Amino acid sequence: EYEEITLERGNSGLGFSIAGGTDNPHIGDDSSIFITKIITGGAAAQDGRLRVNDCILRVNEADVRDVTHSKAVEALKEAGSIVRLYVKRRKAF
């Protein structure tokens, strides 16, 4: 099951936060950064944005799995007006 979320841009804090660590905070093999928390009180929360805690599959139709910490923050922010995130979840066991 996959559900894409197309939210609008912000200005200085959409409302949701993200965590990452490819080569900025500490060395690592997995560049794919994950979400930490969705802070209510922003364009993101206003339109929606659920509580995430994992890495996104793609951003703005492009995979941002090739970034650093400061790049990921900008990869979204600099994504443009409307930002669309795709997330898929497979069922098993």
Side-chain angles (χ1 to χ4, degrees):
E1 298 200 84
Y2 51 71
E3 182 158 20
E4 203 191 21
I5 180 144
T6 282
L7 303 148
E8 75 174 82
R9 189 159 137 280
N11 58 91
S12 69
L14 267 189
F16 74 89
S17 149
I18 51 144
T22 81
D23 217 340
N24 236 53
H26 52 268
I27 327 100
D29 288 306
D30 215 30
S31 163
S32 316
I33 119 169
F34 46 69
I35 306 185
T36 181
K37 42 147 181 241
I38 267 65
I39 292 200
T40 315
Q46 293 231 307
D47 186 2
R49 204 92 264 280
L50 289 183
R51 50 257 157 199
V52 198
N53 265 358
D54 205 78
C55 320
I56 334 190
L57 121 72
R58 87 202 274 198
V59 62
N60 211 95
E61 223 154 20
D63 187 16
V64 62
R65 161 270 227 277
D66 204 82
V67 272
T68 86
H69 206 209
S70 210
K71 243 215 206 255
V73 200
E74 291 275 69
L76 43 112
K77 205 56 213 290
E78 221 257 334
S81 262
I82 270 241
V83 200
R84 55 264 292 198
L85 310 175
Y86 229 126
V87 291
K88 181 203 244 166
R89 316 162 289 281
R90 167 74 159 201
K91 196 137 260 207
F93 66 87

